[PDB]
Amino acid sequence: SGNTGSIINNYYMQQYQNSMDTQLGNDWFSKLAQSAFSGLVGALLA
Amino acid sequence: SGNTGSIINNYYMQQYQNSMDTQLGNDWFSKLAQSAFSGLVGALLA
Amino acid sequence: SGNTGSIINNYYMQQYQNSMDTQLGNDWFSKLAQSAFSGLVGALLA
Amino acid sequence: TTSAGEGADPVTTDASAHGGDTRTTRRAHTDVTFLLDRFTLVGKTNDNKLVLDLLSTKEKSLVGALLRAATYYFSDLEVACVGTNAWVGWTPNGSPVLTEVGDNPVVFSRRGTTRFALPYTAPHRVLATVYNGDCKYKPIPTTFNYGMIYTQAEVDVYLRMKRAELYCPRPVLTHYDHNGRDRYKTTLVKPA
Amino acid sequence: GILPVAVSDGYGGFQNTDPKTSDPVYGHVYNPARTLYPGRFTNLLDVAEACPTLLDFNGVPYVQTQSNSGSKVLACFDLAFGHKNMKNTYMSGLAQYFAQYSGTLNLHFMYTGPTNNKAKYMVAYIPPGTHPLPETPEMASHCYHAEWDTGLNSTFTFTVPYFSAADYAYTYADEPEQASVQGWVGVYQITDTHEKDGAVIVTVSAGPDFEFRMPISPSRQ
Amino acid sequence: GILPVAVSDGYGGFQNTDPKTSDPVYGHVYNPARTLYPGRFTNLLDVAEACPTLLDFNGVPYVQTQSNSGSKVLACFDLAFGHKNMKNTYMSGLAQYFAQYSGTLNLHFMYTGPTNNKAKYMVAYIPPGTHPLPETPEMASHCYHAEWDTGLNSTFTFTVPYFSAADYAYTYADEPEQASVQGWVGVYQITDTHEKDGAVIVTVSAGPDFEFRMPISPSRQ
Amino acid sequence: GILPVAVSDGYGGFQNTDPKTSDPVYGHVYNPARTLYPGRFTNLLDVAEACPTLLDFNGVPYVQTQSNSGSKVLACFDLAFGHKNMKNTYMSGLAQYFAQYSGTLNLHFMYTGPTNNKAKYMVAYIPPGTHPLPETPEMASHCYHAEWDTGLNSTFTFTVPYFSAADYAYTYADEPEQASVQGWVGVYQITDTHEKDGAVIVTVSAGPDFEFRMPISPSRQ
């Protein structure tokens, strides 16, 4: 992802290149956008 | 192990990079820690 | 053999890196050493 | 929990007695091997020589301090001499001191630093950070070394312990001074 | 032709904490056997969990009944590795090398009095922002606490919890920090048979879920 | 022997927008859980489609009946992000960072008058090169337009189309540009019951097929 | 684009004991056959095990009954390659090139007397720290030892063992070293028929488990 693109790869291990994410126990705006009304209120003619 | 992480590898042979270990013929503290009492002495109520 | 150890390899061909050996038509000292008497002359007691 | 503390058997407790949980812990940063696997500056060479002795490590540095937190240890070693100098050379544990390295391992400098890897060379199974040998306490042997380096000029020497093993923990004391204050306090990194 | 390669600026300089190895120079060395060598340790926190070290109360590892003062407080100190009571402990020793930590702690109390001397104690964790830090058992009873009395078992172990807005706290205290951001722990004596002191040795060890992150060499003066 | 390599001129210099990563130096850090954190956004255009922002008509977000003038034009402005009416909108805000765009736009009109005040409006897209920009509903009716009247629903949404010779248009206006290369949008009031104003709040959002290309940091003065 | 590469400081300098090969420059040379060439050797220790070399006792390779002195000691010397008796041996010759060694050694004694001259000898390994080094067979009999007498077989071979606190010992002696850290070997004559000398040629070879480590070029003055 992002603005990095080497068809080949990455030389150093993941635990060194980046921080490791953790979880306990999702794009609000995409969903919000998706939900917009795009129809027609009332009746259409011709 | 340690603080070395190259997804790829090591170029020179093992007999040159490090000293070779030998044996004749085991983490005391891990075991010691593992053995600690973590319960309750006496009876519990409520 | 010797004091050269690259887990990987050699880039140039053999005919360029070294001289090529030939044959017509064997470690004397290893054999000599191997043959040494290591027993006991005479009879042993106790 | 009450216990018979006299016997010295370990006791480690949760917060469960009070209704608590236990958090997931990841102790990668307290791993001994990882910790000691970094370069530490031990100082400069002398007559363009320096005996590789891990006890030369600065005792208040992370590495110097941790190494001293163990009675015995073992490791391989990496060296890096930084400075404007042409070539660093080396001799193993037990070799006589020489006037010139000539012919023993020599490594030439590359962009102002010379870095190279070495093997443990002592004749003992492990080395010690302390050795009560004839020094009767009332209320370090020649052999304990990793060899010696010879350089072309004065340089800063860095050591890096590889494959480290530590045995028999020893104390690690705080080194900051409280002065008279109760808490210690310093200026921590903050947005300016 | 040959492999075209682009040498990059900013890459390659000497590094002291880099993930690569140096080139070898002296091969074929086989070490003496160090099989079964005793006392090996792998993680500082294993030893930190198993070996409690002594707190310091103005020169001595014990808290005590004391002389003149109708003060039931045996000790009340900032939950901080930099507090002077924690000064000689292995935990504070190690903590100077990490920037942050999280997790629980265990405080241990070993009673040293003679068989006929009886007492009853209590220890509480006072959260930050608490106002007049409680000076009486009665007031302190409103905090997370534990009360225990003397008897056959000399030792009692308490768990100092972790509460904070954040998942991690700092091992050091910023200069502009008036109160303990992590609160305090107060140790009180509810009552004692005999006013001639009975010493309680106080000790501290890492809890089972304690953790340190961000190694730092804080070196010098 | 060893791998022969050819170091190339022109390759390797520091780059600010390059596709490669820097060498790591501090390993094994595990972050606090940020599971379920709300309000996440992934593409500026998702927020740009969903959240209309206010146009500015000389200091106020609304267009109005007004005072003296038998002028039925409530607003007529260049279809341009650089027009002063668009000045405080998220769309123009974002547009300053892209060189080109394409796509549709949505204009929204929310009527604010009391229940007994009725009106009838119209909005048209006037293409480039149109001569005397129409000033009357009658003339403007010859363009792509929409007429609507007040009632139970306060809001009306209009789609400003994309016509041009090219597939993409520029977000900025060249110095030598006399007329709007993209035409104009005119908002007219056909009629109103009561001359005491009824404010119509005007707002703008990205259409479903709107798009920006060529990020630029237009920085400074 | 091309392969991004990071050139590292500290790597690449000329090395004299490095594990890589140089680039070739003159190909296709086929050597004359050296098939079956005799006397080949592969490891210095194979020749060192098989070929004993002469010790030196003040100019001569033999130990002897001698003149005036009721001294039964034929030779007593430090178990050290640097001892003057070992001076001209292949073992000491090789040892100057290694820092450490471990293992056993073999001492050989060849009797040179006439048929009617009989004697009885003994050799012992005296460990370090032994006090008054024994001067009599009687006292020396308390050490690891071997007694043998003359007869049909002229030669006798003894095994000098390896005892030390460490697994390896040094081939050289530090300046501040008063006593032999490895002890001594004493050769005594218990008795001899005829006081006219009978020369015993002494020789030394590597034991089957002898070993050298850490090659060093100790070069010069």
Automatic annotation (TrEMBL), chains A, B, C:
Subcellular location: Host cytoplasmic vesicle membrane; Host endoplasmic reticulum membrane; Host nucleus, Host nucleolus; Virion
Segment forming the signal sequence: none
Domain of life: Viruses
Annotated function: VP0 precursor is a component of immature procapsids.
Subunit record text: Interacts (via R-G-D motif) with host ITGAV/ITGB6. Interacts with host MAVS; this interaction inhibits binding of host TRAF3 to MAVS, thereby suppressing interferon-mediated responses.
Family: Belongs to the picornaviruses polyprotein family.
Protein name according to UniProt: Genome polyprotein
